[PDB]
Amino acid sequence: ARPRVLTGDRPTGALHLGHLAGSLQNRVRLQDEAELFVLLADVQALTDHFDRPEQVRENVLAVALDYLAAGLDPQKTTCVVQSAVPELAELTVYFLNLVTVSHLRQNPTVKAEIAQKGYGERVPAGFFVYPVSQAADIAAFGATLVPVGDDQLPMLEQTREIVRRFNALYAPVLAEPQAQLSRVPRLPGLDGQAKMSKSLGNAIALGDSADEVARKVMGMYTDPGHLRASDPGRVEGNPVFTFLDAFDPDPARVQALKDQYRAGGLGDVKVKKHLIDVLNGVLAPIRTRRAEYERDPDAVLRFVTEGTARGREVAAQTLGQVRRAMRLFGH
Amino acid sequence: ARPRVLTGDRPTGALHLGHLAGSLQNRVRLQDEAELFVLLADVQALTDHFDRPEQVRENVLAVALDYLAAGLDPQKTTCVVQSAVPELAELTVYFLNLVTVSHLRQNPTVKAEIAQKGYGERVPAGFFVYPVSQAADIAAFGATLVPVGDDQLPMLEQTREIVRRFNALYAPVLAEPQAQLSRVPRLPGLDGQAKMSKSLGNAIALGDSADEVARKVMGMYTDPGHLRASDPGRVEGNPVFTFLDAFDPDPARVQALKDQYRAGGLGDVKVKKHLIDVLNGVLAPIRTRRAEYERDPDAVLRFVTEGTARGREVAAQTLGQVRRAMRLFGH
Numbered sequence: 201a202r203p204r205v206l207t208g209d210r211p212t213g214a215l216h217l218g219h220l221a222g223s224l225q226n227r228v229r230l231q232d233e234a235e236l237f238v239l240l241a242d243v244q245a246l247t248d249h250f251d252r253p254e255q256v257r258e259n260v261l262a263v264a265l266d267y268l269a270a271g272l273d274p275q276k277t278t279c280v281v282q283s284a285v286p287e288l289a290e291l292t293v294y295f296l297n298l299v300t301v302s303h304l305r306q307n308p309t310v311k312a313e314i315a316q317k318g319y320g321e322r323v324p325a326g327f328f329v330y331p332v333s334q335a336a337d338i339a340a341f342g343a344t345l346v347p348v349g350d351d352q353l354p355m356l357e358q359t360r361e362i363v364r365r366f367n368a369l370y371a372p373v374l375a376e377p378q379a380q381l382s383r384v385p386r387l388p389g390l391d392g393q394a395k396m397s398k399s400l401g402n403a404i405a406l407g408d409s410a411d412e413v414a415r416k417v418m419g420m421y422t423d424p425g426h427l428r429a430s431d432p433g434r435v436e437g438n439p440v441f442t443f444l445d446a447f448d449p450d451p452a453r454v455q456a457l458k459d460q461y462r463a464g465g466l467g468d469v470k471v472k473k474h475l476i477d478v479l480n481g482v483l484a485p486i487r488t489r490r491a492e493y494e495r496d497p498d499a500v501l502r503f504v505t506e507g508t509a510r511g512r513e514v515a516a517q518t519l520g521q522v523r524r525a526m527r528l529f530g531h
Numbered sequence: 532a533r534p535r536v537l538t539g540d541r542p543t544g545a546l547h548l549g550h551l552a553g554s555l556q557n558r559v560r561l562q563d564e565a566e567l568f569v570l571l572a573d574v575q576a577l578t579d580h581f582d583r584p585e586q587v588r589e590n591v592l593a594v595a596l597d598y599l600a601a602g603l604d605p606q607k608t609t610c611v612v613q614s615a616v617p618e619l620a621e622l623t624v625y626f627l628n629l630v631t632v633s634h635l636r637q638n639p640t641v642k643a644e645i646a647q648k649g650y651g652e653r654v655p656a657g658f659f660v661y662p663v664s665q666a667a668d669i670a671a672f673g674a675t676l677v678p679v680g681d682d683q684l685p686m687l688e689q690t691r692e693i694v695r696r697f698n699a700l701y702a703p704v705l706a707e708p709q710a711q712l713s714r715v716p717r718l719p720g721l722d723g724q725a726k727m728s729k730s731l732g733n734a735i736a737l738g739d740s741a742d743e744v745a746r747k748v749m750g751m752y753t754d755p756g757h758l759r760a761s762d763p764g765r766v767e768g769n770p771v772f773t774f775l776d777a778f779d780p781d782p783a784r785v786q787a788l789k790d791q792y793r794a795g796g797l798g799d800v801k802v803k804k805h806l807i808d809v810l811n812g813v814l815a816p817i818r819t820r821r822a823e824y825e826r827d828p829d830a831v832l833r834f835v836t837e838g839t840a841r842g843r844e845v846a847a848q849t850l851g852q853v854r855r856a857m858r859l860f861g862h
């Protein structure tokens with residue numbers, strides 16, 4: 201517990217195996233060698249889900265349950281609800297003056313999302329400027345380390361420009377955050393697509409039953425050219441093997457499996473059955489804690505209402521110095 | 532009282548004659564005909580003066596003084612400093628999700644302001660966005676009536692739109708403001724321009740001495756082509772007449788000079804000379820009123836502090852409604 205690390209998830213659905221490999225595991229590690237803060241960004245979730253406020257509301261508790269199921273320690277990690285800390289909002293609006301529409305339009309990651317969203321020009325304002333609300337999140341909690349995939353680096357980098365701009369314009373009161381680069385490639389979807397998502401229908405939820413997990417794995421895309429066991433099959437592009445690199449404890453088995461697959465005679469059945477055993481080893485403990493916490497709804501609530509209290513006070517402090525630094529009337 | 536009315540100014544310096552005929556005297560009277568709220572657009576002032584925060588701070592107290600001297604009674608008008616009401620920023624954020632960047636792009640007023648400031652695509656985000664920030668101002672204070680210069684109609688119309696869309700998506704807890712058109716269009720500058728502003732240097736502040744006000748009138752643009760008294764002059768384009776037209780109480784008297792001046796026996800001096808006093812007359816009391824308060828500064832601060840408290844009170848009530856209407860987690 202030395203540098204303050206900030207991370208988060210916009211509450212839009214249940215977390216899945218892609219988040220586990222992509223961020224959860226790394227976060228379970230950080231809670232022990234840093235002060236970890238996780239933001240359930242329901243406000244940000246609203247920049248595009250403003251038409252589904254029920255969906256966002258319901259998932260704040262569900263993801264929380266997921267963080268816990270994943271192994272995030274209530275006594276270690278500060279879980280906070282973005283909605284319950286208006287200080288952030290207050291900061292984003294001040295941050296908006298420190299950034300140009302031109303530079304906000306150039307963010308490649310948001311540009312890409314607007315692209316995949318098919319918005320066109322009809323981009324909802326809140327979404328267009330979310331990178332700054334994120335910057336507000338970072339500075340307000342006074343985080344100095346932020347786990348980031350190269351896809352969020354422009355978000356982080358903008359944050360750096362903002363704090364830099366704020367300190368120089370007013371007073372050097374905000375900490376410049378630093379990135380904690382990558383988590384190695386992103387987990388692909390069951391049918392082999394680049395992205396794993398509930399939406400795409402190709403995900404395995406952390407809460408999926410061991411039976412379900414078995415089934416989903418059984419129907420996984422493999423190698424179009426591999427038609428029968430005897431045949432030789434390709435590993436590259438074959439998610440069954442990508443999953444194995446991200447969760448199989450012993451690469452010796454993995455590498456061995458890979459061999460015999462390119463050779464021939466190693467059908468997808470024998471490989472998949474082995475993924476199932478590795479996934480169940482990774483997921484089982486997570487299933488148990490999830491079910492446990494289901495019996496103790498109050499415990500999940502305590503997890504967030506208290507993280508929030510803490511988060512609220514921290515952000516409250518920062519705005520304090522921000523208000524003073526900006527020379528706001530009465531400060 | 533009866534309806535809630537919201538009016539305000541961007542604290543960037545002393546108020547001038549334009550504000551007077553622009554609204555000041557208007558609210559003076561609507562001050563007992565309704566619940567009048569006057570917002571010192573502290574924050575909106577930064578989307579333009581984000582590099583000169585000192586300038587703003589200093590002028591909050593200076594404009595408030597201006598307000599009192601202009602006739603506003605502490606017992607009937609709630610003066611509110613925007614920055615001390617963080618609830619407004621909160622609501623601004625939520626509102627951003629209700630409009631598209633392409634819609635903000637076609638606001639005729641902001642576009643004109645933008646072109647004047649030579650920002651180009653390099654428009655600060657906060658500025659490009661101030662229209663909704665104001666809509667938030669309106670909705671948070673529950674204002675049902677909002678005086679508006681011809682020029683601020685687009686903004687007014689945007690507020691209703693956003694309020695409308697908010698009520699449908701979430702719940703009908705916000706009131707659509709209705710406009711109060713004025714007669715006297717944007718008082719022109721001494722320059723002969725369309726705008727009077729300290730920025731353009733063509734203004735007669737409410738604090739200027741009898742000597743100055745007179746000096747300002749004498750250098751007031753009039754009519755080229757009209758070189759010597761004798762000659763026939765024309766009222767179109769002449770600031771002095773459009774000045775009398777807004778500060779002179781005897782219209783028969785006005786339409787009089789309008790005759791002679793088209794003939795040729797009414798020296799611009801004579802016109803000016805008159806008008807100068809018609810201004811000293813409308814300004815006489817204001818001057819005496821300012822001295823009093825200038826000697827009881829404690830009172831000005833009181834006006835601001837008590838009002839701001841009351842106002843936050845109101846904002847807090849609306850946000851709570853808003854927060855539950857949006858089904859934000861926990862409400």
Ligand SMILES: N[C@H](Cc1c[nH]c2ccc(O)cc12)C(=O)O
Pocket residue numbers: 537538539540541572575665668669677678
């Ligand atoms: N009057 C403004 C600043 C402003 C912001 N919100 C409102 C609401 C109602 C007003 O009457 C004015 C304001 C200006 O002229 O920019």
